[PDB]
Subunit: 275 residues, 3 copies
Amino acid sequence: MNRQIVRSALFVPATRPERIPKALASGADRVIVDLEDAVEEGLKVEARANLRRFLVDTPEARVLVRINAAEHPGHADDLALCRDHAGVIGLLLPKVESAAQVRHAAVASGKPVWPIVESARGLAALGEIAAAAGVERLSFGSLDLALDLDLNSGSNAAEQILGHARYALLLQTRLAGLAPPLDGVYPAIQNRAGLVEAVRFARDMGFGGLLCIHPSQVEPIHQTLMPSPAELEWARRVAEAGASGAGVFVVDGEMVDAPVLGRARRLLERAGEGG
Amino acid sequence: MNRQIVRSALFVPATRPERIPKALASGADRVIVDLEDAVEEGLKVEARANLRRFLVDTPEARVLVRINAAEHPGHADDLALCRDHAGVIGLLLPKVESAAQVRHAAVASGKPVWPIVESARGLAALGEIAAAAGVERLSFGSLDLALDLDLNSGSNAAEQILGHARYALLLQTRLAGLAPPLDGVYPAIQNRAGLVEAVRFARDMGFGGLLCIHPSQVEPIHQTLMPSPAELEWARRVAEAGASGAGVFVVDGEMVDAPVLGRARRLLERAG
Amino acid sequence: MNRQIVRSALFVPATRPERIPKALASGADRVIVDLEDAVEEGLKVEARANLRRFLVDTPEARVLVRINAAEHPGHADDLALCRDHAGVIGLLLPKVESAAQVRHAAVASGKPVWPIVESARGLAALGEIAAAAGVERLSFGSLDLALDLDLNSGSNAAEQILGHARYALLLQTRLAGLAPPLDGVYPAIQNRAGLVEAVRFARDMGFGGLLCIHPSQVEPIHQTLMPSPAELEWARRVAEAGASGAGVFVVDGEMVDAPVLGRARRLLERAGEGG
Ligand SMILES: CC(C)(COP(=O)(O)OP(=O)(O)OC[C@H]1O[C@@H](n2cnc3c(N)ncnc32)[C@H](O)[C@@H]1OP(=O)(O)O)[C@@H](O)C(=O)NCCC(=O)NCCS
Ligand SMILES: CC(C)(COP(=O)(O)OP(=O)(O)OC[C@H]1O[C@@H](n2cnc3c(N)ncnc32)[C@H](O)[C@@H]1OP(=O)(O)O)[C@@H](O)C(=O)NCCC(=O)NCCS
Ligand SMILES: CC(C)(COP(=O)(O)OP(=O)(O)OC[C@H]1O[C@@H](n2cnc3c(N)ncnc32)[C@H](O)[C@@H]1OP(=O)(O)O)[C@@H](O)C(=O)NCCC(=O)NCCS
C-alpha cells in the first residue's frame, strides 16, 4: 500500500520465535517471518503456530510473512494467518510465476503482496506480475535465480545475468507504479565491506533497499543508503546555480539541464531539505 | 528515408540565437535547436521567434529542432514552425512514449521524426516507436533515463542500467531498419579523454554518433569515430585472404569466416 | 530428446573430408560437419558428396551437420542427407528466424535441430524458436551477430551487447525445457588463456559447452568446464551440513539456504559424487 522506501527487510525463520523480537529491535524497516524455505517441511505446522503465538502475544508488532507458494498444502493456512492478524502487514510470495498467483494471494489474505522473483518463469511474466492488483513492491531472490539458471553465484558472469533480472525489476517497478524495490540478499554475513559495496551498487541502480538475513547487516545498509557529504554538496551547488532560473548551466565542469537539476533537487529533498 | 551516418548532433538553445551560427560552423553533422528542456518556460515563446528569424534570415541552413512534447501548450506552435520552414529537416520528439505520438508529430510537421528515448515507458514501447512511419533514427536521453529510473548518473550501476536501454535502441534500430542511432550526451565538456572513451564505447556497440552539447566536442567525436590505422590494415589483410574466395582462413591468429570477411569489407567501404 | 550436456561441438568443413576423422579423434563431444558458410558456393555440391562417403564409409560415426537454410537451392539436398544416414544425429539450422523454419527442417530431416541465432530477427523471435517442435538446444553465432548488429568484435562494448543475446539463449533454454546451450565460437585458435577465460565465463553463466573450430580447443574446453577441487570441496562441506541438520546454516562465512544447498548438491551429482 506504501510508496515510501523500505531500506531493509530482515528474514527470521518462524522456527526461532525468540529471535523475532531481536529482529524487530535491530531497527530494520521491515521484519520478514519466514514459513517457507528457511522452515523444514516437518516444522512448518509448528512454525505457523509459533508465528500465531507471537502475533497474539505482541499485538503492536508489524511484520511481513514469507508464505509457502500455492503448490504447498499449507498455502491456504499461511494466507489465513496473514488475513486474521493485524500484525501481518504484507506477505512475500516466493516462486511467483504469474499474475494469477499474485491475485489469489492478495485476495485470500487481503494484504499487500511483495512478489519475489526467483525463476526464469517469474522473469518472463514480470510485466503481468508487477501489474497485478495487490502488489506493493518487487524484490529479488538472487540465490534462487542462480539455482534456476545454473549460475556460479559470485562470479562476474552470474552477476551479469542477475543484472538482467535487476533491470527487469527496476523497469517494471516504474511501469506499474510500485514502491521502490529491494535488491537481493547479501549472504557473507560478516563481510561488511562487501555488504557496503552491494548496497551502494543497488542504490545507484534505483533500488530502495535490500533484503537482509542478520541483524548486523542493518546498520551498514542504512548508513550506505544515505547520500554522502559529497553527493549532498554537489546537489546544493546544482540547486544554487539553478535558483536564478536558467535553463542550462555548468557545475563541476558538467552541463546541467532540467533532468540533472531535477535529480539534484530530489536528492536534497529525500535527505530532508526541500525548498 | 535518410540512412546516412550522423556522427554528431550538437544542441544549442533557441534562447542564444547568436550561438546557432557558431553551432553550424563547428562542423557537426547536425545542429539541434532546442525549444524544450534547455529553454526556461518563460522564454519559450521568445525562443521560438528567435528560431523563426534564424531560419528566415539563413535559408541555406539545415537544422534539427527539439520541440516541446504534446503535453505542453506550445506543442502545436512548435509543430507549425517545423512544418513551415524548409531549413527544419527533422524534429526531436522528447519523452517519446507511443507510436501515436510519433505518428502525430510526423503527419503534423511533414518532416522526419527523431524519437528521444528518455523513460522506462519509452523503452517498454520502443518496438512500436521504432516501427512507426516517419522515424529516421533513435537517440538516447541518458540523463532523462537517469531521472526517470532514479539512477546515480556516472556510477557503475547506472551505466549497467543504461547499457540495457542502449541495447533496446540498438536492437530496434536493426529490427525496424532505421538509420544509425546516436548515443547520449556526454556532459563533462572539457574532459576530452572521457568524451573520447564514451564515443569509442558507443561506436564499438553499433551507434553511429553522439548527441553533443558544446562545439568543442565535435572534433573529438569525429576523430574517435574514424577507423584507426590498425582496424583499416586488419580489414585490408582480411580482404586479401578472402579475395581468392576461399571458405575459411586465419588472420592474426583468429579464424576468419564469412561474417568476419563481411565485417571487414563493410569497414573498408565505409572508409571509402 | 537428448538433455545431456555437450561440452564441445567442433566445426569442420565438408570441403576437407580428410579432417573429419581428425575432428572425431579429438575427443569433442560433437563434431559439426559444415555445408553452409564455411563452404564456397561452388564447392557445396562436391562437399555434400564428400560428407556422403564419409558417413557411408564410417557407419559408426555420429555427427551434426550445419545445413544451408531454406532459400539456398541445396536446402532439400542437405535435408535428405541428414534424413538418410544414421550417422547424422542432428542438424544446426543457421540464420534461424522463426519457429516454422525449425519445424520444417525438423520434419524434413526427422532429426533434432540446433537453432543457431545469428541475427537480430532471430533474437527477437527466440521465444517462438526455442519452443518449436524438434529443438534440442540453442547456440548462437557470435561473429554473425557482430555483423548483423555492427559490433566491433572483441571489444568490451561488443561483449556487453553479446551478453544480451547470451542471456536470451539462457532464459529461453529454461523456459522451453531444452538441453544445455552452447556459447559461441572463440576464434583466437592458439590463445589458450583467452579460450580458458571465455569457457569459465560461459560455464559460470549456465552454458553447457562451447562451439569450437579447431581440435586443439577441445582439451582446454573440457578441462575448464570440470568443477575445480575448490568447488567440489565447498559443495562437499555444504552438503555435509545439510544432512547434519535442517534449515539455514553458514559455510565459509556465507548463509546457506535451500537454493544454495540445491546448487551444491547438483554440482556433486553432475561430477559423479554425492554428499
Ligand atoms: C543465518 C543465521 C541462521 C545465522 O544464525 P546463527 O549462526 O545462530 O547466528 P549468529 O551466531 O551469527 O548470531 C546469533 C545472534 O544474533 C541473533 N540473530 C541471528 N540471526 C538472526 C535473525 N535472522 N533474526 C534475528 N536474530 C538473529 C541471535 O538471536 C543471536 O543473538 P543472541 O546472542 O542474543 O542469542 C541467521 O542469521 C538466520 O536465521 N537468518 C537467515 C534468514 C533466513 O531465513 N534466510 C532465508 C531467506 S534468504
Ligand atoms: C555551451 C554551454 C557549455 C553553456 O555555455 P557556456 O558556458 O557559456 O560555453 P563556454 O563558455 O564554455 O564557450 C563559449 C564559446 O563557445 C560558443 N558556444 C558554446 N556553446 C555552444 C553551443 N551549444 N552551441 C553553439 N555554440 C556554442 C559560445 O558562443 C562561445 O563562443 P564565443 O566566445 O565565440 O562567443 C552548454 O551548457 C550549452 O549551452 N549546451 C547546449 C545544450 C542544449 O541546448 N540542451 C541540452 C540538451 S542535453
Ligand atoms: C580455421 C581452420 C581453417 C584452420 O586450419 P589450418 O590453418 O589448416 O590449421 P592448422 O594448420 O593449425 O591445423 C593443424 C592440425 O589440425 C587439423 N585441423 C585444423 N582444423 C581442423 C578442424 N576443424 N577439424 C579437424 N582437424 C582440423 C589440421 O588438419 C592439422 O592436422 P594435420 O597436421 O594432421 O594435418 C580450421 O580449423 C577450420 O576449418 N575450422 C573452422 C571451423 C569452421 O568450419 N568455421 C565456421 C564455423 S564458425
